[PDB]
């Protein structure tokens, strides 16, 4: 996260880090005690991933962590890495053993199909991750969160030559400065309502990090809510 503030311990209990070939390479969010959501481009064919929940500082041990392993990688059927690396960027991670919820680990709420689009239309959204703080620079050690406003679709298509599909939205500021970066991809984009938080996006990609004209593009979870509830049911 570029231009983000430090997250207090417990402020984002749904946050989840992903470890594999490189430690802390992507983020994730807790659906329930057994399932994690992340970007499909973070986990490809034959990937050795472990999921750590309840994390604040990566290198420090705060005894609030819950380390688990993935045993079933569920990518969306419409995802094709050979066509587009971010078309239908969503994935499901089934853990080996069901977690136990507390104060530092908590699933994120997911509404139905219609409302998930309503919560997104509010405008304000929060993103968090352990990715790069600067463009091609150092990676964050503590959880960094950032509030980003929803930019209209008409402005987003005219800002980049790459195509923006229907199941993707854009968010960010005009003068750059505050934007997600590499490493944050896979984590949560959430909007709050009267205290309760509801998942509405996943960090997908963007042109560099924090630049005028460019915006962070996210995945529209509203188009996959019915697919998330049916696959993560108990």
């Amino acid at each position: 996260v570029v231009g983000g503030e430090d997250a207090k311990p417990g402020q984002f209990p749904w946050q989840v880090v992903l470890n594999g070939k490189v430690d802390a390479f992507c983020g994730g969010s807790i659906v329930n005690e057994k399932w994690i959501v992340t970007a499909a481009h973070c986990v490809e064919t034959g990937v050795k991933i472990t999921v750590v929940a309840g994390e604040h500082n990566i290198e420090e041990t705060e005894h609030t962590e819950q380390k688990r392993n993935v045993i079933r990688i569920i990518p969306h059927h419409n995802y094709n890495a050979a066509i587009n690396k971010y078309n239908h960027d969503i994935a499901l991670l089934e853990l080996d053993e069901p977690l136990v919820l507390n104060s530092y680990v908590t699933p994120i709420c997911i509404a139905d199909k219609e409302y998930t689009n309503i919560f997104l239309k509010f405008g304000s959204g929060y993103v968090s991750g352990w990715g790069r703080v600067f463009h091609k620079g150092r990676s964050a050690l503590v959880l960094q969160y950032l509030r980003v406003p929803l930019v209209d679709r008409a402005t987003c298509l005219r800002s980049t030559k790459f195509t923006i599909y229907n199941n993707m939205f854009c968010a960010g500021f005009h003068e750059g400065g505050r934007d997600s970066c590499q490493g944050d991809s896979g984590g949560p984009h959430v909007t709050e309502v009267e205290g309760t938080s509801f998942l509405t996006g996943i960090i997908s990609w963007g042109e560099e990090c924090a630049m005028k004209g460019k915006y962070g593009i996210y995945t529209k979870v509203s188009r996959y809510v019915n697919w998330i509830k049916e696959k993560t049911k108990l």
Partner: T-cell receptor, first 110, second 108 residues
Framework: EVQLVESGGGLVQPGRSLRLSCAAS????????MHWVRQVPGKGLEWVSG??????????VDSVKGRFTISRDNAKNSLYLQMNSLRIEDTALYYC???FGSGSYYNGFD | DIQMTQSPSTLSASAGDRVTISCRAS??????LAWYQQKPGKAPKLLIY???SLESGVPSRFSGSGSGTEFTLTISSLQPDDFATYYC?????????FGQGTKVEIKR
């Protein structure tokens, strides 16, 4: 400077086919979308078809939808247009246009 | 889809005058409008984009204004070289409808 050279125009019977070539030069051909725009002497300027930077997004005007085909060769820096089942109403001057700024598919031409 | 209407169809003015060309849209294209100038026998060249932005290299005597459904183009201090047909174009939709164009004649 930026230069776009058309070719392949001429006279053809109704129902036949040609193939226009637009050779680009003086800019990064890979970072800009390209379009075909015709000037009909009775109508005026009219956008005919457009292609994205990597042949991903393709759009046609309703009059040529199903008869015209647009393609590009980023290695050769060339844009092509394949006209099929040509009608007398297709007579016009066919310009080659490149999007400005960010090279977006929904951008105007410079 | 979106009907672009230019006004006037043609006009004549002397050198050093101030010209105003209007361009009205049937809907609301926000600020997605471009102005082109085509001299006889020449290809159209981009002048003003995004309603009010000026393309690099274009003289400062050209100015663009307007937002929403009404747009105007202004040529301060008319020059004989500015004889051409000026077109307005919206790029809000994928059709990119052009205007009917306005021919600018010179009075001498």
């Amino acid at each position: 400077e930026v230069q776009l050279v058309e070719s392949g125009g001429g006279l053809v019977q109704p129902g036949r086919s040609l193939r226009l070539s637009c050779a680009a030069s003086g800019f990064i051909f890979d970072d800009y979308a390209m379009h075909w725009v015709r000037q009909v002497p009775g109508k005026g300027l009219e956008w005919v078809s457009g292609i994205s930077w990597n042949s991903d997004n393709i759009g046609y005007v309703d009059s040529v939808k199903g008869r015209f085909t647009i393609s590009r060769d980023n290695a050769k820096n060339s844009l092509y247009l394949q006209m099929n089942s040509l009608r007398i109403e297709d007579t016009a001057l066919y310009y080659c246009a490149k999007a400005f700024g960010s090279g977006s598919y929904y951008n105007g031409f410079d | 889809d979106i009907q672009m209407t230019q006004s006037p169809s043609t006009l004549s003015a002397s050198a050093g005058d101030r010209v105003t060309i209007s361009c009205r849209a049937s809907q609301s294209i926000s600020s997605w409008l471009a102005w082109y100038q085509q001299k006889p026998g020449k290809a159209p060249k981009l002048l003003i984009y995004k309603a009010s932005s000026l393309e690099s290299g274009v003289p400062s005597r050209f100015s663009g204004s307007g937002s929403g459904t009404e747009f105007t183009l202004t040529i301060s201090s008319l020059q004989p070289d500015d004889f051409a047909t000026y077109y307005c174009q919206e790029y809000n939709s994928y059709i990119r409808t052009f205007g009917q164009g306005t021919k600018v004649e010179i009075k001498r």
